[PDB]
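CO-FOLDING WORKSHEET

Operator: S.A.
Ligand of interest: HHM
Run index: 305
Mode: holo prediction, single chain
Checklist:
[x] sequence pasted
[x] SMILES validated
[ ] output reviewed
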Amino acid sequence: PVKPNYALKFTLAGHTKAVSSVKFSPNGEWLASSSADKLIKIWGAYDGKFEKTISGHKLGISDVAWSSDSNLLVSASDDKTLKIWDVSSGKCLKTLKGHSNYVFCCNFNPQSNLIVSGSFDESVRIWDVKTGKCLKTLPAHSDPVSAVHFNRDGSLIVSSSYDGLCRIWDTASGQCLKTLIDDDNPPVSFVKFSPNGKYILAATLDNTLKLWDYSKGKCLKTYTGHKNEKYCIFANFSVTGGKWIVSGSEDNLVYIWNLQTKEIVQKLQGHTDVVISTACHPTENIIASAALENDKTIKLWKSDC
Ligand SMILES: O=C(NCc1cc(Cl)cc(Cl)c1)c1cccc(Cn2ccnc2)c1
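OUTPUT RECEIVED:
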């Protein structure tokens, strides 16, 4: 497989405002979406069929994340709070209060007993799932936080911000172990670990994605061609078939790169506004995508490799 062949299979309509994020469940059954319309929705991952709507937040939602057993959800909202949800019942189990401004990004750790979050108050907080109380507050940045992610065994946390920085945090201690500085520092709009945990993928608002060896502090790969200067766009590692890099773009397209050669191998067309979020299915060659206010739709593409 030197090139994939993703083609549209389903289009998922429902949200009455801009979509903010989409995520696949670990067991591979479901797709979850958050939106500016305060709502969370669940969809069939193979058939694109609507399942249910989960409500509660008093303002818009920017992000959502699955637990490892596909039974819980955490969400980050403009009401300065996070909420933990039981997917089956639709009940709100906990309401994480702490941040003093918009909560923008969230994630479970591999063990799924902890939750990390980033906020416009320029901080990162570590929460306990069962008690719902905050364990650590990290003075991470001097600008809004754009992304937070656990590594493979949950021992590390990576974060990014509009201040231009990427930082590695020890989960147990809460100490700052590393700070990534390039030749220049444009705002970092996204970051996350690699599946093997050796690398991080970082995006900056100068239309550029990069692969970093964080321990040795050097850039290994660079990916360009798309447009990204205003929005924090998600990016993924595609591992089920060919080894690609997936990301949205401000020109209403989904870009797919060959991880090694850094070549654009496929560009997906269909949306009518900025593509803000993408995700990759855990066992099948399926990609999900979502778009902003003028579009409001979610799309499911499938490939043979
Ligand atoms: O780009 C956005 N706002 C502009 C912005 C962001 C920050 Cl952090 C700061 C400023 Cl000043 C302006 C945006 C809004 C809603 C949903 C997502 C998708 N997403 C990405 C990560 N989590 C959700 C991105």
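REVIEW:
The pocket of HHM is lined by residues 20-21, 62-63, 104-105, 144, 146-147, 162, 231-232, 234, 276-277 (CB under 6 Å).
The chain has one domain: 1-305.
[x] output reviewed
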